[PDB]
Design an enzyme around this catalytic site. Structure first.
Site, PDB file in Angstrom:
ATOM      1  N   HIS A 123       2.306  -2.729  -9.071  1.00 39.72           N
ATOM      2  CA  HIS A 123       3.034  -3.600  -9.992  1.00 39.72           C
ATOM      3  C   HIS A 123       4.359  -3.020 -10.457  1.00 39.72           C
ATOM      4  CE1 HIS A 123      -0.960  -5.497 -10.228  1.00 39.72           C
ATOM      5  NE2 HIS A 123      -0.279  -6.588 -10.530  1.00 39.72           N
TER       6      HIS A 123
ATOM      7  N   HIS B  52      -7.749   2.132  13.394  1.00 38.86           N
ATOM      8  CA  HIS B  52      -9.059   1.496  13.522  1.00 38.86           C
ATOM      9  C   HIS B  52      -9.398   1.472  15.011  1.00 38.86           C
ATOM     10  CE1 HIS B  52      -8.346   0.193   9.431  1.00 38.86           C
ATOM     11  NE2 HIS B  52      -7.426  -0.685   9.781  1.00 38.86           N
TER      12      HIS B  52
ATOM     13  N   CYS C 147       3.230   1.970 -11.906  1.00 40.53           N
ATOM     14  CA  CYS C 147       2.201   1.471 -11.009  1.00 40.53           C
ATOM     15  C   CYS C 147       2.697   1.328  -9.570  1.00 40.53           C
ATOM     16  CB  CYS C 147       1.680   0.123 -11.513  1.00 40.53           C
ATOM     17  SG  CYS C 147       0.488  -0.642 -10.414  1.00 40.53           S
TER      18      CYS C 147
ATOM     19  N   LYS D 286       6.388   1.672   9.021  1.00 39.91           N
ATOM     20  CA  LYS D 286       7.329   0.596   9.307  1.00 39.91           C
ATOM     21  C   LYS D 286       8.724   1.028   8.885  1.00 39.91           C
ATOM     22  CE  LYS D 286       8.993  -3.869   7.817  1.00 39.91           C
ATOM     23  NZ  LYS D 286       8.123  -5.041   7.502  1.00 39.91           N
TER      24      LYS D 286
ATOM     25  N   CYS E  56      -3.586  -4.325 -12.792  1.00 38.83           N
ATOM     26  CA  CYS E  56      -4.339  -3.892 -11.630  1.00 38.83           C
ATOM     27  C   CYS E  56      -5.777  -3.805 -12.070  1.00 38.83           C
ATOM     28  CB  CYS E  56      -3.902  -2.496 -11.206  1.00 38.83           C
ATOM     29  SG  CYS E  56      -2.505  -2.436 -10.092  1.00 38.83           S
TER      30      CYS E  56
ATOM     31  N   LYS F 256       4.633  10.532  11.160  1.00 38.11           N
ATOM     32  CA  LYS F 256       3.642   9.544  10.764  1.00 38.11           C
ATOM     33  C   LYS F 256       4.139   8.124  11.008  1.00 38.11           C
ATOM     34  CE  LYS F 256       1.124  12.102   7.321  1.00 38.11           C
ATOM     35  NZ  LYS F 256       0.145  11.722   6.251  1.00 38.11           N
TER      36      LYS F 256
ATOM     37  N   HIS G  31      -5.513  -1.982  12.912  1.00 39.39           N
ATOM     38  CA  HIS G  31      -4.417  -1.205  13.475  1.00 39.39           C
ATOM     39  C   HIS G  31      -4.851  -0.126  14.455  1.00 39.39           C
ATOM     40  CE1 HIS G  31      -4.892   1.293   9.559  1.00 39.39           C
ATOM     41  NE2 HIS G  31      -5.353   2.045  10.539  1.00 39.39           N
TER      42      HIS G  31
ATOM     43  N   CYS H 284      -3.693   0.769 -15.332  1.00 40.14           N
ATOM     44  CA  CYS H 284      -2.816  -0.396 -15.215  1.00 40.14           C
ATOM     45  C   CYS H 284      -3.680  -1.618 -15.504  1.00 40.14           C
ATOM     46  CB  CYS H 284      -2.202  -0.521 -13.820  1.00 40.14           C
ATOM     47  SG  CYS H 284      -1.049  -1.934 -13.696  1.00 40.14           S
TER      48      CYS H 284
HETATM   49 ZN   LIG Z   1      -0.771  -2.471 -11.703  1.00 43.89          ZN
END
Ligand SMILES: [Zn+2]
Length: 500
Positions: free
Chosen positions: A147, A22, A144, A300, A130, A297, A19, A127
């Site tokens: 999740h 970078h 989370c 999207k 995760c 900032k 992006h 988590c």
């Molecule tokens: Zn998770």
């Protein structure tokens, strides 16, 4: 020995889509490497990718792929983007390379045998889907972040690094070395983190939890997690211990980063170097955010995302690079937009440079018989040869916009000149003072073109071509007046910066 320059960009998460952020950092880092190379420096420019982890690991598994083949592939995304962006790095270090694993375990073994690494317990919100710990901030308060389900308090067996042990040394070091952390604002920020305990650093995770990564040299059942892996790429690409590249460039290390990764570079990294018996870097140069047009900032959800490859596709690699280096004061959060790129393009590039080259070429054929006139004196225009000396410190002190602003002002001054002398009005009276004016414009264009080469390599080389000048250059050549040779310019040349 003498003039040596070394610059690095962070190593990017291999499964992260390239992006603007970078792109920006790598473009600045490249301007710096290109500038010093032009200035007779022995230069090393490094960039690369962060290839380990479990999230990257899982992603490769979903498609039924081998983690190593998956990274050989998605890491090509950054390589293609740097080709597109005309980035001339010297090396691209990948964390899966063997020369990298060897240095990681080498340095880990060093710190371990010194007594700075110990085994303990890491408790906290966790988590299980995760298989990763989080903080209040991380987990979307209540569950989370990935999740969307309640977290669970748990302890894990990890190895730690006595980081707090080196805080007083780090703190005093930055106080004694004020220019270490570049934009000042970020220096005070860091100095504040050091006023309070920084704690110890967890550097590994069980392989049963994270199988993808470099194993601990003293315990193969544990994998190096983040810090001692990715951070060591700056010394690993230089073949750290015995490599001559290490002896040559490390003493001059200039790390370029976004403020987003300020603690790891300004707090963690330094204590690691101390503990490893490796010299500190010279400068940590911190960039700010490239905000959307709204000045908020880039998000999207917000709908203010500026794609550098669309801008690049539409206006050219050189145009996007110049605007980025010219529009933003490094270290400062600055809003970007296509309309801002557009106006800079039409004005600075299309009009100020492109047009004067084409109208000067036209006037060469008409009043000087299609060849560079015999060299004269610059008079008012001779002061352009002292610009290289003015831009050096600006550049080295991260003032790229100001540097470009001064070089381009000389170009504006060049237009001003011709429009003021009126070479077409002069041919009638004195066609010698008509050619002298034209030679001053050519020589001035030569000089300015050298200054702008690090920001626009290809186009400035092309500009040189369109006027029949020596293509490959050196910064010193811009410090002497009268080097443009009175030879014939090409009968044909395209338009430098075509209408968009
Ligand atoms: Zn998770």
């Amino acid at each position: 020995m003498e003039k040596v320059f070394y610059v690095t960009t962070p190593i990017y998460y291999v499964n992260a889509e390239p992006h603007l952020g970078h792109a920006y950092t790598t473009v600045v880092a490249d301007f710096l490497a290109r500038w010093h190379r032009l200035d007779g420096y022995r230069t090393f420019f490094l960039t690369g990718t962060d290839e380990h982890g479990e999230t990257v690991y899982r992603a490769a598994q979903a498609a039924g792929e081998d983690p190593k083949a998956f990274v050989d592939r998605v890491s090509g995304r950054f390589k293609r983007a740097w080709d597109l962006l005309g980035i001339a790095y010297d090396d691209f270090i990948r964390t899966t390379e063997e020369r990298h694993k060897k240095v990681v375990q080498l340095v880990l073994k060093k710190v371990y045998e010194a007594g700075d690494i110990y085994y303990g317990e890491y408790e906290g919100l966790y988590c299980v889907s995760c298989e990763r710990f989080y903080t209040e901030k991380e987990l979307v308060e209540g569950l989370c972040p990935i999740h969307g389900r309640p977290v669970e308090r748990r302890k894990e067996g990890n190895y730690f690094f006595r980081m707090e042990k080196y805080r007083p040394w780090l703190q005093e070091y930055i106080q004694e070395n004020p220019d270490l952390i570049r934009p000042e604002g970020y220096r005070n920020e860091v100095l504040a983190m050091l006023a309070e305990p920084i704690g110890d650093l967890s550097i590994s995770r069980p392989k049963s939890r994270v199988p993808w990564g470099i194993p601990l040299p003293w315990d193969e059942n544990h994998v190096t997690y983040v810090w001692f892996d990715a951070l060591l790429n700056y010394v690993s690409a230089l073949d750290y211990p015995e490599g001559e590249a290490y002896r040559t460039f490390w003493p001059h290390a200039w790390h370029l980063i976004g403020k987003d990764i300020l603690k790891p570079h300004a707090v963690f990294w330094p204590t690691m170097l101390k503990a490893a018996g490796i010299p500190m870097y010279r400068h940590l140069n911190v960039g700010g955010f490239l905000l959307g047009p709204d000045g908020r900032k880039m998000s999207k959800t917000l709908g203010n995302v500026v794609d550098p490859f669309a801008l690049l596709e539409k206006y050219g690699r050189d145009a996007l690079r110049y605007y980025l280096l010219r529009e933003i004061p490094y270290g400062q959060d600055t809003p970007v937009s296509e309309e801002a790129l557009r106006t800079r393009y039409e004005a600075d590039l299309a009009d100020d440079l492109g047009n004067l080259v084409q109208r000067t070429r036209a006037m060469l054929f008409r009043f000087a018989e299609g060849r560079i006139p015999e060299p004269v004196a610059g008079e008012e225009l001779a002061e352009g040869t002292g610009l290289a000396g003015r831009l050096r410190p600006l550049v080295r002190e991260l003032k790229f916009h100001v540097a470009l602003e001064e070089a381009m002002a000389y170009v504006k001054a060049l237009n001003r000149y011709i429009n003021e002398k009126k070479p077409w009005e002069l041919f009638k009276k004195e066609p010698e003072e008509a050619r002298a004016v034209l030679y001053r414009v050519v020589e001035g264009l030569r000089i300015a073109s050298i200054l702008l080469t690090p920001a626009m390599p290809d186009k400035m080389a092309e500009l040189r071509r369109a006027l029949g000048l020596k293509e490959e250059v050196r910064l010193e050549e811009a410090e002497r007046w009268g080097l443009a040779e009175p030879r014939p310019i090409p009968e044909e040349a395209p338009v430098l910066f075509p209408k968009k």
